[PDB]
Structures are given as structure tokens and as C-alpha cells.
Design a protein around this ligand. Structure first.
Ligand SMILES: *CCC(=O)Nc1cc(Nc2nccc(-c3cn(CC(F)(F)F)c4ccccc34)n2)c(OC)cc1N(C)CCN(C)C
Length: 287
């Protein structure tokens, strides 16, 4: 009863990329200039073990099948000696951004980021897609006013039953740690941890506690603390994302509604000191 995935996998010529510089490691900053049409597109290029190909091709499959203003768009792959070509998000991952600009993030930007992440996550749930790695590090920043979800290296297309492997323990639900079960609601848990990272301006969840004890702590009933800038209204939303009963956690469509209400009066829900004074074509316009 599944629908045919008629997504298009675009294959680009290497002679069309101008690897400007290295963004990290390898991921490169560059330009994609399609032959003929006078257009330069700022892109990120993710550059031979047969496992690595099989996995980056799996990620290219997922990114080619999603199309949402809050999900990272795939432009294509290059079959050299395999490269992912994605939209360049010039302000980096949201985790490093809130850490850099701690003294400039207003309650407006925080609550709006929570709305946008829930929108992209709700879209992924519409596509019957479990992310399995939602975190502040995996949310990229196009502009301070526009963020998108990235990194689908663990994404799965539908509960999902994993069989093993390295996984980020402090972001995943209890059911994911004990039974390797992943659902859209286990993504809601990771959403709760991701909101906690933003409200704490990039603090590390369970900083110091070894990952092997996380399963014990959560079973005891202990959760992440209430961030200083958070009213009980916002912290209650995170707490609901951390219920043991997965179906008691809020839906992504509900998290959109809640944070949108808060985004209409941000200073009522986030208390931040000084909150008052805080031919190039982008990929989104090349269709
Ligand atoms: C989280 C860190 C970082 O974001 N650095 C960064 C990123 C970008 N833009 C950008 N656009 C699209 C894709 C990426 C990107 C994706 N990955 C993961 C993987 F698997 F490697 F593809 C990256 C890893 C490392 C770097 C970039 C990756 N990024 C950017 O645009 C100019 C700049 C930067 N920085 C160098 C800033 C460093 N941090 C944010 C302070």
C-alpha cells in the first residue's frame, strides 16, 4: 500500500563545481554553475570503502525524497571516485551558532527556531520518515530567521527496530536505548533535548555523566534541568516530550501550535537579560 517514490536523483558533472574552500572534515564550500543557464548556486560538497558509498547513497535517497522549507534540500550527487551536493547554509549548524552568539539570541529567535524545527519534523512525519538523530548540531542555519533540519544518515522510512551501531545516547528516548525502538514519538523526545540545547544556549546534555548510565538515570525519573531563561510554560513542553509513555508525548503538529502562540509574546515565555536590544541564486530559488 506504499506510494511510488517518484523523486528525481540529479547527477551533476564535476566540471560544474568550484570547490572554494573547506568547511570542515571532507565538506567543501563551493559554487554550482549549471552549463548554459547563467546561475551560480552556493553549495556544500560532501566528499572509497564500499560501506561508505552504500551509506552516503542511502542518505542521498532520503534527501532526494524530501521537499520542505525546513528540511535540507538535495541538489544532486556527483559520481566521481561519491559526493553529496547540498544547499550551503552559511551560518552553520544551530548548535555552534547559539554558542557563538549567546549574548545576542533573543527570545524571538529561540521560539521561532522551535516552531520551524517542529514544522520540518512534522513534514518528515507526513513522509512516514523517522529521523533518529535530531539534535542542535543537525539543524543548519540559512539565515538567523530560517533554519532547516539536516543529516539523514540514520533516517528510516516506515515503529522501527534497529539492530546495532553507534548512536547518540543522550538525545534518544528510553525505548530507543532499551529496545532499539524508533518512532516519530522517539523523535519528539530528541526534539525535547534539542529545545533544551537552544534554551541553554548550547549546553551539553547530562554533561559529565557517561552515556552508559543514561539508561539508569532516566528509569529513576530524572530529566534534564529547567533552563534559567525558561518559564514553567516552556519547560513543561520539554518535560512532556520526555514522558516514558511515548503516546503521551506531544505531537509535532501540536508543538507547532504551542510555540507559535508563545512566539506571539516571546518575553512572556523566555526571560533573557537584555532581550530588548538583541548571478548568484540561492538553492531555494533555483527550481
Ligand atoms: C555544525 C557545523 C558547521 O555547521 N560548519 C559550517 C557549515 C556551513 N554551511 C553548511 N551548509 C551545508 C552543509 C554543511 C555541513 C554538513 N556537515 C555534515 C557532513 F556530514 F559533513 F556533511 C558539515 C560538517 C562540517 C562542516 C559543515 C557541514 N554546512 C558553513 O557555511 C559557510 C560554515 C560552517 N563553519 C565553518 C562554521 C563553523 N561553526 C558553525 C562555527
Amino acid at each position: 500500500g506504499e506510494a511510488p517514490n517518484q523523486a528525481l536523483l540529479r547527477i551533476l558533472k564535476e566540471t560544474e563545481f568550484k570547490k572554494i574552500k573547506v568547511l570542515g572534515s571532507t565538506v567543501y564550500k563551493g559554487l554550482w554553475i549549471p552549463e548554459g543557464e547563467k546561475v551560480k548556486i552556493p553549495v556544500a560538497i560532501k566528499e572509497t570503502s564500499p560501506k561508505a558509498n552504500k551509506e552516503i547513497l542511502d542518505e542521498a535517497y532520503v534527501m532526494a525524497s524530501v521537499d520542505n522549507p525546513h528540511v535540507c534540500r538535495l541538489l544532486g550527487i556527483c559520481l566521481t571516485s561519491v559526493q553529496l551536493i547540498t544547499q550551503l547554509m552559511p551560518f552553520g549548524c544551530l548548535l555552534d551558532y547559539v554558542r557563538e552568539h549567546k549574548d545576542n539570541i533573543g527570545s524571538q529567535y529561540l521560539l521561532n527556531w522551535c516552531v520551524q524545527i517542529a514544522k520540518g519534523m512534522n513534514y518528515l512525519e507526513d513522509r512516514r520518515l523517522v529521523h533518529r538523530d535530531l539534535a542542535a548540531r543537525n539543524v543548519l542555519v540559512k539565515t538567523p530567521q530560517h533554519v532547516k533540519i539536516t543529516d539523514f544518515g540514520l533516517a528510516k522510512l516506515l515503529e522501527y527496530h534497529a539492530e546495532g551501531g553507534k548512536v547518540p545516547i543522550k538525545w534518544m528516548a528510553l525505548e530507543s536505548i532499551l529496545h532499539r525502538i524508533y518512532t516519530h514519538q522517539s523523535d519528539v523526545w530528541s526534539y525535547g533535548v534539542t529545545v533544551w540545547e537552544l534554551m541553554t544556549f548550547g549546553s551539553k546534555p547530562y554533561d559529565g555523566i557517561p552515556a552508559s548510565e543514561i539508561s539508569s538515570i532516566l528509569e529513576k525519573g530524572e530529566r534534564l534541568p529547567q533552563p534559567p531563561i525558561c518559564t514553567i510554560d516552556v519547560y513543561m513542553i520539554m518535560v512532556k516530550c520526555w514522558m516514558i509513555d511515548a503516546d503521551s508525548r506531544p505531537k509535532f503538529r501540536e508543538l507547532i501550535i504551542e510555540f507559535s502562540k508563545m512566539a506571539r509574546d516571546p518575553q512572556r515565555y523566555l526571560v533573557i537579560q537584555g532581550d530588548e536590544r538583541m548571478d548568484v541564486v540561492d538553492a531555494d530559488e533555483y527550481l
